[PDB]
Scaffold this active site. Structure first.
Site, PDB file in Angstrom:
ATOM      1  N   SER B  88       0.825  -1.193   0.000  1.00  0.00           N
ATOM      2  CA  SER B  88       0.000   0.000   0.000  1.00  0.00           C
ATOM      3  C   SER B  88       0.866   1.253   0.000  1.00  0.00           C
ATOM      4  CB  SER B  88      -0.905   0.035   1.234  1.00  0.00           C
ATOM      5  OG  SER B  88      -1.800   1.142   1.181  1.00  0.00           O
ATOM      6  N   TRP B  90      -0.779   3.953   0.887  1.00  0.00           N
ATOM      7  CA  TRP B  90      -1.424   4.565   2.049  1.00  0.00           C
ATOM      8  C   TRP B  90      -0.543   4.348   3.273  1.00  0.00           C
ATOM      9  CZ3 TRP B  90      -3.223   4.198   6.919  1.00  0.00           C
ATOM     10  CH2 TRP B  90      -4.221   5.095   7.328  1.00  0.00           C
ATOM     11  N   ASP B 154       2.001  -0.058  -5.246  1.00  0.00           N
ATOM     12  CA  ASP B 154       1.149   1.102  -5.511  1.00  0.00           C
ATOM     13  C   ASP B 154       1.982   2.297  -6.025  1.00  0.00           C
ATOM     14  OD1 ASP B 154      -0.522   3.232  -5.509  1.00  0.00           O
ATOM     15  OD2 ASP B 154      -1.216   3.007  -3.431  1.00  0.00           O
ATOM     16  N   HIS B 181       0.546  -0.726  -9.961  1.00  0.00           N
ATOM     17  CA  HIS B 181      -0.732  -0.145 -10.345  1.00  0.00           C
ATOM     18  C   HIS B 181      -0.746   1.386 -10.311  1.00  0.00           C
ATOM     19  CE1 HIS B 181      -2.358   0.917  -6.353  1.00  0.00           C
ATOM     20  NE2 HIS B 181      -2.044  -0.283  -5.899  1.00  0.00           N
ATOM     21  N   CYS B 192     -11.475  19.983  -0.784  1.00  0.00           N
ATOM     22  CA  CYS B 192     -12.060  20.022   0.555  1.00  0.00           C
ATOM     23  C   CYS B 192     -13.422  20.718   0.490  1.00  0.00           C
ATOM     24  CB  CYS B 192     -11.137  20.792   1.510  1.00  0.00           C
ATOM     25  SG  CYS B 192     -10.873  22.556   1.045  1.00  0.00           S
ATOM     26  N   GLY B 193     -14.279  20.417   1.457  1.00  0.00           N
ATOM     27  CA  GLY B 193     -15.586  21.059   1.555  1.00  0.00           C
ATOM     28  C   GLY B 193     -16.713  20.141   1.123  1.00  0.00           C
ATOM     29  N   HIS B 194     -17.941  20.599   1.382  1.00  0.00           N
ATOM     30  CA  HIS B 194     -19.166  19.835   1.107  1.00  0.00           C
ATOM     31  C   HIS B 194     -19.280  19.430  -0.363  1.00  0.00           C
ATOM     32  N   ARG B 229      -6.138   1.429 -12.130  1.00  0.00           N
ATOM     33  CA  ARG B 229      -7.146   1.765 -11.138  1.00  0.00           C
ATOM     34  C   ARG B 229      -7.972   2.963 -11.583  1.00  0.00           C
ATOM     35  NH1 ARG B 229      -6.376   3.268  -4.649  1.00  0.00           N
ATOM     36  NH2 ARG B 229      -7.728   5.132  -4.673  1.00  0.00           N
ATOM     37  N   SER B 316     -12.103  -3.142   1.358  1.00  0.00           N
ATOM     38  CA  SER B 316     -11.901  -2.031   2.300  1.00  0.00           C
ATOM     39  C   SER B 316     -11.798  -2.498   3.757  1.00  0.00           C
ATOM     40  CB  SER B 316     -13.022  -0.992   2.189  1.00  0.00           C
ATOM     41  OG  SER B 316     -12.880  -0.008   3.199  1.00  0.00           O
ATOM     42  N   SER B 318     -11.870  -0.315   6.301  1.00  0.00           N
ATOM     43  CA  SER B 318     -12.579   0.679   7.119  1.00  0.00           C
ATOM     44  C   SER B 318     -14.067   0.349   7.244  1.00  0.00           C
ATOM     45  CB  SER B 318     -12.422   2.053   6.488  1.00  0.00           C
ATOM     46  OG  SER B 318     -12.849   2.013   5.141  1.00  0.00           O
TER      47      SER B 318
END
Lengths: 412, 412, 412, 412
Positions: B88, B90, B154, B181, B192-194, B229, B316, B318
């Site tokens: 990963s 990540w 990755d 990948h 960022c943001g809604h 990906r 996943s 999470s």
């Protein structure tokens, strides 16, 4: 501010500050000034951490640590409740040196490997403090964690001579270490086969290193905690016979390489501990078999000559604790050492065992039951939330929230 | 061998070999040769690993892996029974990049970091293999472990343009990666943001990277497994409109930064899957919500236009699995995805959760009950011995016995 | 100190300190504090060097530098009497990045590379000072050299988004940089062919990086000198058309990629210079052809809007100076630009050309006349002793005397 | 291939190949195979480079090299017509180690520092061959440069004991080194004061290192050229009197450290030279004073017992050649030495002097005349274009051409 003025200033501090109570230096403050350069660069974590470590070590019943090989491991130890971090040379060798190789514990890795792992942990600890502080939580508030726990780091035997020792100390302070330990063996000249084992250097040389390590701490302007390890309990070979402190332990035999055989055990251990005591802040007799009786004897032997001297003690991960000790002895063990003067205690290979068992455990299941194996771990993670495990929230843990904050601050 | 003669033999390769069945290159063999240089340095590990990963990918019901961030973690995965290792970006960003900082997944760490960790795992695996061989275990013997499991690494989105992509692939192959990948987002400009989130690049640019990634592979002379990906299931922004492949998914809207809003979902994912399918060896739709229905739809959609084409799936870590599934579907999850054609599956952050849980669980006990928390871990280790866990014998694991054999060979 | 009090002292400082005169921060002192963390870590070199650099460029006629790619190059520059050090990304890409690759100038090397070199230079400069001091020389004494000359660092385009720039700035400051520059191109996507060249990013995104850089500098607690570079003089491409500051220069065409063609030259450069001036301490219009006429127009263009704004200027190492300017023009060139307000000037690739010519030359004679060719070099080195060249005493130069001091202080 | 067959094939190679004539291996083919692992990994550059170096050394009147500390320097050395590259440990210590520190020559830098530089130089050369090849040039065109010149690298004394030397030799090989030397001093324990200097290790130990080195070459599967250096001409201390070969030279005196004072000179140098000859490919007696007379006696003494043993000679850069030798002697020096058997000759600090002088000369002028100083260098660079200096076309030199070709290959 003259050289003379800087030297007097430094000298008064050694005399006045009770940090330096009973600590010999085989060099003058005028020496430290000559080797400073003209400007002193500040090393915040090395300074704050060393002071924090000193305070913890002297006020608390004892401080216990686990060996960390990554920033995350160290972080989860602070979150779990621990107050200091131990950086194992063995772990670094095994699985986290800058050469990227897997090695045994014989000083094979590059001399900068541990200081780079000290910086790793401090950079992770710095991030967590930033994440906490970015979310409004002040010191005093309920739940606030001081993430800047002191790191204590393995410095092997200096990776060569006094200058290597001197440079290794500096690398550690720069990387942000609160304490450093130098052992008195040569793991680069370990005799193999029967009649082999660890090989010691003269007390003369072990002392010259600690003198070097303290010169380096002073030149850097940090009161770093200096730990003197002796391997004398099991080391039955010595490179030379010149030091009168060591002659009493010679069996008279020599090896093909030219080493002298010596009588190992407590008496050899003690003579080292006593010789290193004036120069070190903590003394450490490396042991393989954990034994309170042995520990008491060593403690008393050192305390006869240096009363109230801080000691440290490593609890072997290799030893089978259930087979040899009953639960009451296991459960009281660290407390009893704490009473004796062992104010710093640690499991060296904690992180190795943790990392290696976790992954094997998951993987074996994963190979058999696939995703069900992972859920076993995940559920275990949810069960741990209560006790203070935030890593389930993976994104917040690595600092996603903090950097969003950063991006939002700029893009506005 | 002349340039013509080398170019002929390379083309003949691409037409002859069933490995290259179905795969399109936007460049000629003459181009590969013009960029090779006069001599072709050999990369033993990259080559053999791609070949082993290929046969696995095409023969086994499927291949499943777990994220590893150190040599130790990988090494146990092979000892546990797993036949492949996933790396990963990540986890490297979080805890094992060469900057030594804790970052979130946004290509913040230095571009050589993942290849550095590829090299670690292969150094450790090389050491696993040396130990076994030095003990006199030959292949075919009982318990013999092939330590050289292929690594699937990755590469994010190449860290810049086509050249960064090209250079990263060479780094991965030189380290000895067996699969690499590339993804079609810019995490470096995530909103960022809604009204934000992940942001795609034009199909044109993603394909541009895939070409560079494969050109890299050919110049290095290795049949590296390339994986594409798409993040087009959830990502609802794109940096530009130029590609006609993408226009159908636009919603006409534009953000402040000059991005274009898109309609996320299976159809957007699908077009990217179809776009990349001629260029990459396996196609992977990154999903946050694991779903067998979704999987089967995307499997049937791609297979209609490219039948048999290999795929991979990220499970996943999470996502709350029990919360949203029953044990029976969970226990048959990977099994089923195999049948659909997801021949490579993995938990990206397995290593993070494995590392971070164990150390916390251990330290929390160690904090409150000292040595007995370590005893709990030590007993768990002894139980795992039956199942193949050798790490209890810590000295042998890290190479002590191998390096003793090196010392004995010299000193005799 | 509470959060509001900290933000009070910081906010007031930005208003009280003439250092920040004319400078705009698109973020508040509360944001800085929110993103600092609980404790601030000190960076002595970054701070002292930033304060020193500022003093020089404001009080001296003009500060000039040559690009240095090792610590020795830098060390010599200072002994030659130069007062500042320039650190090219081109030279790093070409010969001194951590990937160890020879690369062209397209941000191909690992992002941590230039900081590593900035740190190397400072380590070397620290060592020249330790030597000088250890020999007893004091400030004020004849011959005393101030070895801590500030370093201005190439941060390219920040290697991605605003977080990438944020982080690189922090690396620049941690490594002890005193100035850092960011350019408004995206070298990573440089178009090839006749219809190509450098591609610009919107004024919007450039300013976003500059603010990111300032935020970091404030978060580190150093008054680092920020230099904004424009490539608008040559660049006739732009990634996106959203920003109204750029619309005046668009031709309306679009390349296959989606870039928008633009009208290059002094007008495009001024729109960028003017746009960046509020955010940056120096403005830099990059040029290929040196031209006093062009310089003056740009200087005056900026100065109408921003009177007395500090500017910097690159003097191309590739331009044929003797073929296109007479000796008297060459001789006055940097003095002339100073009066216009170009207070920091440099030759980007001075070290590349020094290093490559000097070795080729030596090697070419050595291959033919062996030791007679080296004696030519050695005899030149002897003539340099008059002028301050100490490196013939090669042992002392690398710190042999200093470390014999450290050996002697530990031993006896 | 079973273990038995592998050993036999490898044993046949040692008894058959003239490459290994007169080379003693204190170990067996069986041993090499036991420590190989189950799969040998290929190291193209080290293998081809070794073979090439072996031919050059056995066929040329002699081979000569200069010390290179960057890839650019080695690149210019090859362009100027030199046939091999030398990598000084001294130079890496001073300006090119991975610690980033300026150090004197006492094994202070991290042990992987020199291999990393061997890897840099090889990458640059690899890139040069890519640029050339992509321009259409083939082997056997008029001017086609073979950029892959062999590198002979400094391993100091192996940075510890046998296993450290073993691992360093492996790092060299992996980086692509063709030759490697190991010396017989402990630099790390250098005696300070007036009664001091370098300190020799026992003959027995220096041979163990050489044995280790060779075992590593064989395990790596490459015929690496092993040079054995002795410091016994000027070294007048030794760690121990254990070896019968050394006893003859002891003066019976001892130091506080417990070292034995020896009688330095030619005689002690010969006893080491003879002692090492059977395990080394070349022999090198390092000298402070270049004296043909001495060089003769030493050559003869060695060739008395080992006729036609290949020797190597370092040509001191500190020696004032003009004050001490007339120009005709200076002119004949490397030719004369070659006629005695010194087939590899080199100036160790050539790189250090070339880099420092050039930058000082440029910078001193630059401080006083600004650009006119740079124009002197640039004119100097144009004059060397006749002779093969290509670096003024600076974008091509660092691979802008090659990478453009790659971008155009991808975008088409």
């Amino acid at each position: 501010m003259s050289r003379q003025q800087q030297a007097q200033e430094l000298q008064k501090q050694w005399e006045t500050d009770p940090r330096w109570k009973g600590i010999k230096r085989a060099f003058t403050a005028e020496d430290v000034v000559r080797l400073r350069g003209s400007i002193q660069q500040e090393h915040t974590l090395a300074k704050r951490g060393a002071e924090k470590l000193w305070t913890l070590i002297n006020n608390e019943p004892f401080v216990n640590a686990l060996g960390a090989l990554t920033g995350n491991q160290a972080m989860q130890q602070v979150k779990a409740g621990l107050k200091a971090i131990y950086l194992s040379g063995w772990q670094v060798a095994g699985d986290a040196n800058v050469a990227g190789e897997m090695y045994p514990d014989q000083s094979l890795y590059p001399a900068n490997s541990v200081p780079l792992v000290v910086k790793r942990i401090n950079n992770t600890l710095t991030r967590a403090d930033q994440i906490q502080w970015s979310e409004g939580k002040n010191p005093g508030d309920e739940g606030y964690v001081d993430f800047f726990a002191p790191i204590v780091a393995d410095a092997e035997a200096g990776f060569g001579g006094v200058l290597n020792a001197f440079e290794l100390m500096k690398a550690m302070i720069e990387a942000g270490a609160s304490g450093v330990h130098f052992e008195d063996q040569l793991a680069s000249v370990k005799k193999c086969g029967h009649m082999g084992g660890k090989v010691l250097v003269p007390t003369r040389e072990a002392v010259a290193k600690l003198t070097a390590a303290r010169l380096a701490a002073d030149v850097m302007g940090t009161p770093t905690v200096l730990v003197a390890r002796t391997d004398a309990e099991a080391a039955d070979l010595i490179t030379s016979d010149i030091d009168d402190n060591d002659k009493p332990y010679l069996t008279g035999e020599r090896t093909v390489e030219g080493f002298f055989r010596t009588k190992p055990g407590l008496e050899q251990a003690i003579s080292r501990g006593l010789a290193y005591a004036p120069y070190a802040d903590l003394i450490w007799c490396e042991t393989g078999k954990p034994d309170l009786e042995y520990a008491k004897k060593f403690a008393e032997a050192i305390h006869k000559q240096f009363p109230g001297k801080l000691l440290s003690y490593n609890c072997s991960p290799s030893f089978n604790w259930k087979k040899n000790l009953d639960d009451a002895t296991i459960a009281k063990f660290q407390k009893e050492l704490g009473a004796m003067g062992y104010k710093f205690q640690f499991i060296t290979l904690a992180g190795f065992h943790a990392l290696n068992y976790s992954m094997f455990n998951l993987a074996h299941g994963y190979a058999r039951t696939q995703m069900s194996a992972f859920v076993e771990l995940q559920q275990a993670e949810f069960a741990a939330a209560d006790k203070g495990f935030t890593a389930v929230k993976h994104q917040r843990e690595v600092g996603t929230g903090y950097f969003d904050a950063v991006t939002q601050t700029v893009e506005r």
